[PDB]
Structures are given as C-alpha cells and as structure tokens.
Write a protein that binds this ligand. Structure first.
Ligand SMILES: CC(C)(COP(=O)(O)OP(=O)(O)OC[C@H]1O[C@@H](n2cnc3c(N)ncnc32)[C@H](O)[C@@H]1OP(=O)(O)O)[C@@H](O)C(=O)NCCC(=O)NCCS
Ligand SMILES: Nc1ncnc2c1ncn2[C@@H]1O[C@H](COP(=O)(O)OP(=O)(O)OP(=O)(O)O)[C@@H](O)[C@H]1O
Lengths: 91, 422, 91, 91
C-alpha cells in the first residue's frame, strides 16, 4: 500500500505487522487525526455549538453542528454540519 | 530582475481577500490571511493556505486597525510582502512606514506619496502647480461667517459647505439664500466642531449638473506610467456610488485625450508608482474640474479589467517584484477597447424606507452564470448570517457585452435569475 | 390595507369589514393558498415523503421534508426543506 | 465574415463521475459538499450540482461544464488549473 518512504514505519511493522497495517488503514481512511480537542475526539461536538479545530500553523477550522436526521432508506442517517461559513450534510 | 516574493499576506476582509488569493495562487505563491474573532464564519479564510487570529481583545471594527499585532504576525511567518487592499490601513501613511521598517515590502505607493495625498490642501496645491484646473474655492480652510460672505459675494450665490476630517458626505448641504445661509453655517460649524475634529470648511460653487469621470493609473519603479482608460459612475443615491459604466457614455474624443493626458501628467509630476485612481468632474458646457487622487486600487476596477482584458492584480504584484512594464508586455499602444461592461453592487439595504441597512439570516441563495456574467461571491452562501458591524455587500455582479443595451439586458436577466430569501 | 380593490371588494367591506381585514392580512402575510390538498392544508406534510403542490397549470413544484432543528435563540427556528432540485432553509 | 475576429484562447473540460484509475467506470452516489470556483476568466455551466444531489445510474454522468478563457494558451491552462483546484466535490 502507498508510496511513502521512511525507515520508522518499517521498524514499527517489524515489531508488529498487524497493528501497523490496521493503523495505516485507519489513517488512510480518516485522514489526519490527533489535531482535535481531546473532548472533541472523545465525545464529539455538542448540538448546535461552534467549536474550533486546528490542523497546521495556519490551517484552522471552525465547525458548527446543525442537526441529525433519521434512517432514510438503508439505515443511513443524514447529519447536518456547518463549516466556517458553509453548511454540510453527510450520509 | 530583483528579489522574488515567496509569501503574501492581506490586511482586509471580503472580496479583496478572495481576489488577491486567486491572483497569488495563479503565480504559485503561498497565501496568509487574517481574521477577527467576530469574523470567524466568513468564506475568505477557507481560500487561504494559513489564517491567523488578530485583535483578540479589541472592537470588531478596530481589530483590523491594530498595527503592532499585524506586524508581529508578519514577522513570525516569514512573510515577504503585505497587500493593503482598500479601506483597511490602505490610506494610512504610518502603516506603510511600519511595514518598510520591518523589512517587508508594501504593495502600493511609497509612504511619502501617501502623505502627500490624503489632506486636500497639498493635493490642490500640486494640481494648481501645473495645468489640471480645479473648482473655484478657498485655498485655506474657512471657519468664519464673514469671509464666507465675501467668497459668496465674489464668485456666485449657490455654494456648498465641504468639510474635512473624512472624505465622506459629512455636512454636504447647499445654500440658496441668506436667511438659511447664516443658520446653516452655524449648524454645520457646530456639527464639525462637536461630532468631528477640525472645523475645517470650504466655500466653493455647487456644479448644478455634475458628471464625474475616473481614470486608472498604473506606473512602475522606473518612471514609466500607463493609464488604462476612463469610467463613468454618475449614478449616486445621495453621495455614494451605485452603478458604474466601463466606457464613457458620451464623451468628446478631444475631451477624452485631454483628460487622459492631464491624468498622466499629474501622475508623472508627483512621481506616482502603483495602481492609482484619478478622479474628475465635468460640466454641461464642458469643464474638467479635478477633485482628488485615490492612492489605492478602487472597488470598481473590475469593469476596466474586462474591457482591456489586462489583470490588474497580476501587474501590481509583478511591479512590486521589480519587473518593468515592457518586460511584462504592456504598452499604451498595445491595449485597446473591446465591448462594454456594467457593474452593480448587491447590498442588504431596504430600498423603500431610507436605504436603511437590514440584518438577518439568509435562507435561500442561488446564482446566475451565463455568457457575459462574471461573479465575485464575497460572503453570500446558504445559511449565512450578515453582521451589522461591517459593510453590507453581498455579491459584486459584472455583465459584459458588445453594446450597452445588450449588457444591460444581460444584467437584468442575471438579476432576475438571482434568488435571495430571508 | 388594500391593493386589489374592485366593486365587489367594496361590497364585502360593506358587509364584513372586520373578517375581511383579518382574511386579507392573514393571507398576504402567509402567501397564497388553494394550491394545497386537504392533507397539506389542515394537517400538512410529513418527514420522509415527497408530495406535490399545483399553483397554476404552467408550474408544479416538488417538496420534500428533510428535517427540522430545535429552537436556539430569538425564537427563530430553522427548518430544512428541499424544493425540486435544491435545498432550502427558512427562518 | 468581416465582423468576426479572434480574441484570446479558451480551454474546455468536463467534470464527470468516472474513475480514471480502473477503467473510467462511472460511479454513482450522493454529493455531500459542493463548491464553485468562479474567477476572472472562468465561465461555469452547472447542469446538476448542489448539496445533497443524487447521481442517476441510468442517465448521463456529466456534473459541471467548466470553461476557462485567457489571452494565451499557457495562461488559460494556469487559470483552468487554479479553477479546478478551487472546486471541492467530496464523497
Ligand atoms: C490545500 C490544497 C493544496 C489541497 O486541498 P485538498 O487536497 O482538497 O484537501 P486539504 O485537506 O489538503 O486542504 C483543503 C481543505 O482545507 C480548507 N482550508 C484550506 N485552506 C485553509 C486555510 N488557510 N485556513 C483554514 N481552512 C483552510 C479548505 O477549504 C479545504 O476544505 P474542503 O476542500 O474539504 O472543502 C488545495 O486544494 C487548497 O485548498 N489550497 C488553499 C485554497 C486554494 O488553493 N485556493 C485556490 C485559489 S485562491
Ligand atoms: N463641487 C461639487 N459639485 C457637486 N457635487 C460635489 C462637488 N464636490 C463634491 N461633490 C459630491 O460630494 C462628494 C464629495 O466626495 P468626498 O471626498 O467628500 O467623499 P469620500 O468619502 O471621499 O467618498 P468617495 O471618494 O467614495 O467619493 C463627491 O463624490 C460628489 O458626489
């Protein structure tokens, strides 16, 4: 998987292949973790409150939670979020 | 030829930030944006590589006016140049000096030229120095009723009181009598001394039928100055611009070339060196009366940008780098007119009561894009909240066509296609 | 309050000025009617169903009830409906 | 013939829900976030692109018709590249 080059991950897989593969899959799926607030990462946003998450020295995001719908057709709820100025809806 | 720029920061908010970010991304330059605590939900920070908070414990409008915080932000992020936009520290000579003292280039004219501009006395003295005739009026500020009476008696009866401490309307009242003249002078003087600072007023004739022309001025660091073309924005609600027409509506070609040459000469004499604006004023018989000089890039530059098809921000950044105009391939014999354009500013002002601003939440938003429609979405999107602290501009819509009626009809269609509810 | 007066409107004002005023203010405030079925008019639509409203024979517009938020501030709730091909939110 | 002249250069691209990796096999699903990339010399012809849109598996798979205009071919290419980078169509 991937075309990333470093010895550290090779060593880590040498100690543990399975956990390394699972962690790599999780990171490739959900992108950059460990940029969240601890409470945000543990419980998630509270309803209709604006929180802030930073990603880099200049990359900072403010996200607002709008609403959550119910099972539409195949148990796939539609949750509504707000961007810094925009709004989001996710299946 | 000289040191290139690797990173640029902007000191404004709204549409200018977006425009400058697009221009920089076209040239592969990193972008840095600033924002205040209240201005946290806008769309102008998602279009930048990095955005930083400023004015944490300040007023919502005065957060963007704190020089030391901006300088400190610039120092820690290895910023090479800063863009002043328009109306946010752009016309403050001290800010340019502070930027220069920190090793950061300032995108615009030198602080000396900015200080020369601003106050009207030096501008009038420079204009009267060579050609460029100005409106009849007093040279020094007027603070007395009696001297106002002699200047009323000499030139003519209808006069307008023009204030200082703000280029805005202020006490823009006209005198047609004497009984009302004394009381209006007293009221205006009291308002100037109380609500404002200097009670500087001027006695000058009110042109009965004004019609003012703008010219875009572009110059380099090597003493080469290029004018783009003229404009007309005579449509004014009370004293603010409403609708702009890119080419001149009906101007004599001799008047066109005379006004262009006068603008170029005035730019040369001061030795101006960046995107700059020269305003005028025309009477019915034909009298070009100089008004003022804007040292920044004007908000109605887009219409000039499309007739010439020359990108102004690109040229501004290139001339900030140090490249001369001939290297860029820009000559006054190389540009030409192509069609007509119209610009309209969409605001949240109730057009019935008093043009009073309205605040609320946008529930429905839609856009219309066609053959000759260019759109500049500042802060208009689904579920947006408009604040009462800043300007009330939603979208800047520009329409281009081969003729004036065609462009007008296209703009009417585009406006009909828009839908703003709430 | 008048915008449409015809001699029959004068006649109605002659018989029932009060209920006519109430009628016109209520309807002009809340848009036109008569385009909705009884389910719509007396009970209204439900979440997770698409229904149809006929205004005039030239046009017919689709409505789908996505979700409704909870009251937050200023007593100004926001609800998310979709008109045919877009999504709408109303104050 | 005499009144028609050349002025500038233009480039055309079509955004399609095709997977360029495997076989350009068309993909179906629901659009979760959409954003526009209008600019200086950018003309946009949005066919069907909006929040919560659904792509039909049986009709054509055109999302947005994007047109970039410039004074020269490299300039148009650069403008089109920046305009495409501004577009964000996740999911
Ligand atoms: C960053 C980039 C190289 C790659 O973007 P990407 O692969 O699609 O996704 P990334 O997570 O890596 O970064 C972009 C995302 O972070 C957001 N974000 C980007 N810059 C930001 C900044 N200074 N501050 C706060 N948020 C920012 C963007 O809105 C985008 O969100 P979205 O596409 O999901 O709606 C490029 O797409 C980008 O966004 N550059 C900054 C904006 C830009 O390039 N504008 C071009 C014209 S100015
Ligand atoms: N002699 C005059 N005759 C008629 N109208 C005048 C005259 N002088 C000024 N005005 C009007 O009053 C305005 C005065 O401009 P002023 O410099 O006070 O405003 P400002 O805040 O700089 O605004 P802006 O630069 O955006 O026009 C002019 O724009 C014009 O509309």
């Amino acid at each position: 998987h991937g075309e990333e080059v470093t010895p550290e991950d090779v060593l880590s897989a040498a100690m543990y292949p399975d956990v390394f593969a699972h962690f790599k899959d999780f990171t490739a799926t959900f992108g950059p973790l460990d940029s969240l607030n601890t409470r945000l990462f543990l419980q998630g946003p509270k309803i209709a409150e604006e929180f802030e998450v930073e990603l880099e020295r200049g990359k900072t995001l403010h996200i607002k939670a709008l609403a959550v719908s119910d099972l539409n057709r195949a148990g796939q709820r539609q949750v509504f979020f707000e961007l810094n100025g925009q709004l989001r809806s996710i299946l | 030829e000289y040191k290139p720029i690797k990173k640029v920061m902007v000191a404004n908010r709204g549409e200018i930030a977006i425009r400058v970010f697009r221009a920089c991304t076209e040239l592969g330059i990193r972008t840095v944006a600033i924002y205040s605590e209240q201005d946290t939900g806008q769309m102008h920070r998602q279009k930048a590589d990095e955005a930083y908070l400023i004015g944490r414990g300040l007023a919502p409008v005065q957060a963007y006016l704190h020089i030391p915080d901006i300088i400190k932000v610039a120092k820690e992020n290895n910023v090479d140049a800063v863009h002043p936009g328009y109306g946010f520290l752009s016309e403050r000579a001290d800010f340019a000096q502070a930027c220069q003292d920190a090793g950061v280039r300032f995108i615009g004219p030198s602080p000396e030229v900015v200080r020369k501009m601003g106050d009207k006395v030096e501008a009038r003295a420079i204009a009267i120095a060579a050609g460029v005739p100005v409106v009849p009026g007093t040279d020094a500020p007027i603070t007395s009723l009696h001297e106002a009476h002699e200047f009323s008696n000499t030139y003519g009866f209808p006069i307008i009181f023009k204030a200082a401490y703000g280029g805005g309307g202020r006490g823009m009242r006209v005198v047609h009598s004497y009984e009302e003249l004394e009381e209006n002078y007293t009221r205006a003087y009291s308002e100037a001394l109380a609500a404002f600072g200097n009670g500087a007023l001027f006695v000058e004739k009110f042109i009965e039928k004004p019609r003012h022309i703008e010219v875009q001025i572009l110059g380099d660091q090597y003493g080469n100055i290029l004018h783009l073309y003229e404009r007309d924005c005579s449509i004014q609600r009370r004293h603010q611009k409403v609708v702009e027409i890119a080419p001149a509506a009906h101007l004599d070609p001799q008047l066109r070339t005379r006004l262009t040459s006068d603008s170029v000469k005035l730019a040369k004499q001061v030795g101006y060196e960046n995107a700059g604006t020269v305003e005028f004023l025309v009477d019915r018989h034909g009298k070009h009366y100089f008004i003022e000089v804007n040292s920044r890039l004007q908000v109605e530059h887009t219409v000039t940008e499309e007739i010439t098809d020359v990108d102004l921000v690109h040229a501004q950044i290139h001339v900030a780098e140090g490249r001369s105009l001939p290297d860029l391939g820009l000559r006054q014999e190389n540009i030409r007119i192509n069609g007509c354009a119209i610009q309209c500013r969409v605001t949240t002002e109730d057009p019935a009561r008093s043009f009073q601003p309205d605040t609320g939440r946008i529930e429905v938003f839609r856009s219309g894009e066609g053959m000759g429609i260019r759109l500049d979405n500042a802060s208009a999107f689904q579920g947006a909240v408009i604040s009462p602290h800043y300007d009330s501009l939603l979208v800047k819509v520009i329409a281009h066509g081969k003729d004036h009626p065609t462009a007008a009809t296209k703009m009417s269609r585009a406006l009909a296609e828009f839908r703003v509810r709430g």
